[PDB]
Structures are given as structure tokens and as C-alpha cells.
Write a protein that binds this ligand. Structure first.
Ligand SMILES: *[C@@H]1O[C@H](CO)[C@@H](O)[C@H](O)[C@H]1NC(C)=O
Lengths: 249, 49, 294, 49
């Protein structure tokens, strides 16, 4: 039955969620892209899970600040059973396992992977690579048949790091079909059960044009969301972070 | 600045689709059948002219 | 008067190394096939793609390539190779075309209007007809709306033509959309079974993973040559560059929206691409009556 | 009301040129001219602009 309870709070996205639009290098240039981005200063749902499904929308920005590997995977699907294609990712201490099988999920699956899924059957794709987890930020995106996860790891001093941290497409595309994905469920890791807490951050992506600054080394260093405020729109239409005094159409 | 703007506009519009499948000429040349290649090339020509 | 383009001297292909091969066989010899409503879509990735095996097979009734020139298939690189095997009647082969509408096209399998690839249809009447009847192959002739490109519908929905649901039983305005093909050896073209494999390609900015066989000749630096680095063909001079590309990819570009720098499928060396020297030529001449020296 | 057309038997060639078939119910027309005749199957493809 249901044995995981989550508490919801709301917080500010600040200036996180910027990712590289393409695998094209650039140096000391300003670029304008129209993509599924995380809107600056948006509502971010903060979930605390104690020993619950979520919609997917057009894309999800997942952030964690955990230390002792409490989160160890993700589950994606439309019906969360064997009737429809699913996508299950597990992050053990050694590697990452991605499966596109017809897994049938429990009502409240949780982490040997006996408890997460009851049975396995005919699959579509399988991928084994280096583990994702070694502030961990991930951006999910399934638009043109491909599945994209962008990842980044940053240190911690206090709260969400306000400065801009770009997300690099390391895990690449899984070349799936992923069917009509419409939901998303997280996987927390228990032990062989006294207490347990989670630090989920879930944000939604939305079609929005952003302007990105590349330094001399090809790394994004700052970004402007054109729809955030009139000043940002002026910066976008002027193709420059600095704006001279005047009036601009 | 006006001169630089004009030159940059020309170079940037060199990459415009102008209703074609792709902005790269060699890709269309090595990728398309000669009639469709002619059609797309004519579109790109009209745009660049 | 004229230009002075420094004509290239040599050619270098540096397609990445995999030196393996393609399924391209189990998507064509496969003992059994699939329906048009239930069509197997296999993603071929990581390969060398020797299309010679396709020509090695039986003659093809309609070997029509829409987005790609059939002879130039081996030269270009493609991200994902798709095998779509199904059986349709001969007269329904023409319906498998971008921009063309028809019962099989709209209610069974709709190719995109901007489809790039090759449709390989050949007669398979040698061994498809049985006395019992080839009811295995099925097609849908009724659906609520038009199918989106690259969409599959295998569920049997009760056709509710009337304003009241048929409730899963037969009656007025209650007809099953699915229809079984009738395959007879003596029937002429239009009812004979035809095996159709649709090769769907996707040209984009991810590693080729599938690129017809071509051996890479070595690199030539300070000089003016063609380069073919994972499908991007061009002309320039390859020089050592101090730019530090992040591991993401290689398609380096500058403010001019041009391929300034590129990485090769051998070392991850990043080479800056500069255009081969060129300019305009001008003739300084005196009056023609004065002298002919220029 | 064009739903009665869909209420009839499946159509070999239901080809709409100047109007989207799904947009038929929403649109308004000035005149409607129904021309009915009988031709052989291979002759159907000749009835087009
Ligand atoms: C750019 O990379 C070089 C490495 O050669 C390094 O010395 C420099 O500090 C980097 N600059 C920035 C702004 O990261």
C-alpha cells in the first residue's frame, strides 16, 4: 500500500535551469535560442518524502541537495503499468541502468530491485553507462522522439546557489520512442527502516526565448529571459547585456 | 557600426532557409534528386539575390 | 574581371571508426513480417551501412527515394536508420509517399510530408499465398481522425458512426474498422502481396552512428582540401587551434555562423577551419592604342 | 450537416481540395452543387482539378 508521504512547499527558481541548446561550440558571442527553458524566478515545488505521482508537462527540472544517496532513480510513463511503454532509470553505486521495458509499477514503488517492479518482460531499449550521481541538477526533455537528460553537479554552501550554473548534455540521447509520456515518478532509496527524508525540487519547462553568453572558453556564464521583465526584453532585443540610457521600441 | 551591422546582416542571412529544406548548398547538392535540387537551389538564389 | 579561388588539391574523408555492419538483413529476410496497422519499427544505430546488400536482393517493384538520391546513399552519414517492414497490396504501394493521401496512407501508416528516406517495395508472391487464407495481414480503413505522421494504432476501437455507442456488438452503424487482406496467387497486380520496407532517415547534429562504408585517408594540415567529418562536407585549410572545446561535441562556430573549428573522429584534436585563399583579380592597363602590356 | 456523409459506407476516394474535410462543418458556403454519376474504379483518379 501507500507507505511514503510527501510534504510540499514553494520556492523561487532564481537563475537556474539554463542548459546548452545544441552541441555547437561558441566563443565570446551572444546567442539567442527559442527552447523549452526553465523560466527565471518561477514557482518551484519542494517535496520532502518521509517513509504521490507528478505530471510531466513539456519538461521537468529536477534538483536535489541530498548527501547519502537517498534518491537512486526515476520512473517515467503514462499508465505506470505493463500496459504502456515506460522508462526506468536506476543509479546504483557502480553504474546507471536505463530500461524501456513494459514494467508494471507498484502504487508506491520504492527501493536488489525487487520492490520497485514486480516483473520484467519484453523490452525496447537498454543502456548501461557510468553512474549519474557521484547540488545535483537534471533537465528532462522528450520532444522530437529523442530523450534528453542534462546534468550538472555544484558544491553547497547555503541554499540554492544563486549564481548561474550551466547544465551539460553528458548522458546524451537514448534514441527511444518513449510513447506519449505524460507523468513522472521519483525513486527514493531506503535501507535493508528507521527514518528517511528527501529533497525533491520539481520545476516545469515552457516555450520561452533566452539569450546566452559564452565566455572565451565556450562556457555559458550568464543568461537573460526575454519575457521576465521589460529590462530583460530590452536586453534581448538589443543583443547585449548592457543597455545605454535611452528609449527603445 | 552601421557598416558592421550591414555586413553582419548579410552573413547572417546567408544561413536563412528562404523556404528551403536546408541552408547548406553542398548538403542539398549531395542529398537531393536533380529536379528537387534545382527547385531548392532556385529558392535559395531568390533569397540571396 | 575575375576571381582567384585557390582550387583544392586533395580529399580527406575522416568518418569515425566502427568498422562493423548493419542489421540490414534481419529487416529484409526476416522469415515473417508485420501488419500495416501493426508495423515493426526497428532503430538501426552504430553501423557502417553497406547498401550493396539491398541491391544484392531481388529486384524491387518501387525503389523510390524521396529525400535522398539513391546512388548517393553510401556517401552521406545519417543519425538513425529505421526499418519499417509490413505487407500491403500492390495498388496500395503508391499510397506510401510524402504528400499523398489514401486509405492505407491516412488510416494505417502516414509518412511525414517532408519525409527523407527510401521506400523499398518488392513483390513477395513467390511464397505468401496459402489455401487457408492470408488473414494474418490486416489493415485499418476507419478511424476517428487522420493519423499523425509516424503514428501507430493497433487497438480495435468500436466504430461509433451513430450518436449512440455500438456497445461492442454488431448492428446498424456498427462495423469493425479492421479488414483482412485476401491474397490469391492468380490475382493480378493490385491484390498480390507486396513486402514494403521503409528506410526512414534523420539528418541532424548528433554523431552519425550510421555511415555507408568509406575509409578515412590521413589528415593534411596546412593545405587546402575537402573535409568530410561526420557528414559535414566543406572546403578549407586545417590548422592547429588553441580553442578548448568542452567534451559536448565538435561543431565549432563563430559569430559569422560558419564552421570555424571542428573535431575529428580519431584524436579529439580540434582543428580551426579557415577558407582557402581567394580574391578578385584586376587588370591595370594603359590605353589600348598606347600599348598592349597589362 | 456533413456528418451523414461519414455515416454512409467507407469511401474509396474522399478527396477534398480547397476545403479541409474536418473544417467542413464550421465553414459557411454560398452555393452547394451536387454532381452525381457512375464511373469505373480506375477512372476515379481522373476526377480532379
Ligand atoms: C579559460 O581557459 C584557460 C585555459 O587555458 C584558463 O587559463 C582561463 O582561466 C579560463 N578562463 C575562464 C574565464 O574560465
Amino acid at each position: 500500500v501507500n507507505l511514503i508521504t510527501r510534504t510540499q512547499s514553494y520556492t523561487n527558481s532564481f537563475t537556474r535551469g539554463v542548459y546548452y541548446p545544441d552541441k555547437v561550440f561558441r566563443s565570446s558571442v551572444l546567442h539567442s535560442t527559442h527552447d523549452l527553458f526553465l523560466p527565471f524566478f518561477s514557482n518551484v515545488t519542494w517535496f520532502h518524502a518521509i517513509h504521490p505521482a507528478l505530471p510531466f508537462n513539456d519538461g521537468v527540472y529536477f534538483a536535489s541537495t541530498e548527501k547519502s544517496n537517498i534518491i537512486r532513480g526515476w520512473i517515467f510513463g503514462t499508465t505506470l503499468d505493463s500496459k504502456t511503454q515506460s522508462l526506468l532509470i536506476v543509479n546504483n553505486a557502480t553504474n546507471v541502468v536505463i530500461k524501456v521495458c513494459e514494467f508494471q509499477f507498484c502504487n508506491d514503488p520504492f527501493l536488489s530491485e525487487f520492490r520497485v517492479y514486480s516483473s520484467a518482460n519484453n523490452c525496447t531499449f537498454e543502456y548501461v553507462s557510468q553512474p549519474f550521481l557521484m547540488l545535483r541538477e537534471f533537465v528532462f526533455k522528450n520532444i522530437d522522439g529523442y530523450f534528453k537528460i542534462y546534468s550538472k553537479h555544484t558544491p553547497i554552501n547555503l541554499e540554492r546557489d544563486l549564481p548561474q550554473g550551466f547544465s551539460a548534455l553528458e548522458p546524451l540521447v537514448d534514441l527511444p520512442i518513449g510513447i506519449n509520456i505524460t507523468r513522472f515518478q521519483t525513486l527514493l532509496a531506503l535501507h535493508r527502516w528507521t527514518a528517511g527524508a528527501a529533497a525533491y525540487y520539481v520545476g516545469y519547462l515552457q516555450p520561452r526565448t533566452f539569450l546566452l553568453k559564452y565566455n572565451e572558453n565556450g562556457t555559458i556564464t550568464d543568461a537573460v529571459d526575454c519575457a521576465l521583465d521589460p529590462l530583460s526584453e530590452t536586453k534581448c532585443t538589443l543583443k547585449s547585456f548592457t543597455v545605454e540610457k535611452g528609449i527603445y521600441q | 557600426n552601421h557598416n558592421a551591422q550591414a555586413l553582419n546582416t548579410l552573413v547572417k542571412q546567408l544561413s536563412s532557409k528562404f523556404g528551403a529544406i536546408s541552408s547548406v548548398l553542398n548538403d542539398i547538392l549531395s542529398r537531393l534528386d536533380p529536379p528537387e535540387a534545382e527547385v531548392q537551389i532556385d529558392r535559395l538564389i531568390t533569397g540571396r539575390l | 574581371t575575375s576571381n582567384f579561388r585557390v582550387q583544392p588539391t586533395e580529399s580527406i574523408v575522416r568518418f569515425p571508426n566502427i568498422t562493423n555492419l548493419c542489421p540490414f538483413h534481419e529487416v529484409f529476410n526476416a522469415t515473417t513480417f508485420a501488419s500495416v496497422y501493426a508495423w515493426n519499427r526497428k532503430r538501426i544505430s552504430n553501423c557502417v551501412a553497406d547498401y550493396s546488400v539491398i541491391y544484392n536482393f531481388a529486384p524491387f517493384f518501387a525503389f523510390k527515394c524521396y529525400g535522398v538520391s539513391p546512388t548517393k546513399l553510401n556517401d552521406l552519414c545519417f543519425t538513425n536508420v529505421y526499418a519499417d517492414s509490413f505487407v500491403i497490396r500492390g495498388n496500395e504501394v503508391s499510397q506510401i509517399a510524402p504528400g499523398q493521401t489514401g486509405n492505407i496512407a491516412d488510416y494505417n501508416y502516414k509518412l511525414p510530408d517532408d519525409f527523407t528516406g527510401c521506400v523499398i517495395a518488392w513483390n513477395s508472391n513467390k511464397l505468401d499465398s496459402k489455401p487457408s487464407g492470408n488473414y494474418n495481414y490486416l489493415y485499418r480503413l476507419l478511424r476517428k481522425s487522420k493519423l499523425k505522421p509516424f503514428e501507430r494504432d493497433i487497438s480495435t476501437e468500436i466504430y461509433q458512426a451513430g450518436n449512440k455507442p455500438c456497445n461492442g456488438v454488431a448492428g446498424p452503424n456498427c462495423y469493425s474498422p479492421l479488414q483482412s487482406y485476401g491474397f490469391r496467387p492468380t490475382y493480378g497486380v493490385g491484390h498480390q502481396p507486396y513486402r514494403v520496407v521503409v528506410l526512414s532517415f534523420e539528418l541532424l547534429h548528433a554523431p552519425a552512428t550510421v555511415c555507408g562504408p568509406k575509409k578515412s585517408t590521413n589528415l593534411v594540415k596546412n593545405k587546402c582540401v575537402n573535409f568530410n567529418f561526420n557528414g559535414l562536407t566543406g572546403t578549407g585549410v586545417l590548422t592547429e587551434s588553441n580553442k578548448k572545446f568542452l567534451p559536448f561535441q565538435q561543431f565549432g562556430r563563430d559569430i559569422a555562423d560558419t564552421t570555424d573549428a571542428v573535431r575529428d573522429p580519431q584524436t579529439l584534436e580540434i582543428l580551426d577551419i579557415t577558407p582557402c585563399s581567394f580574391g578578385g583579380v584586376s587588370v591595370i592597363t594603359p590605353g589600348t592604342n598606347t600599348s598592349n602590356q597589362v
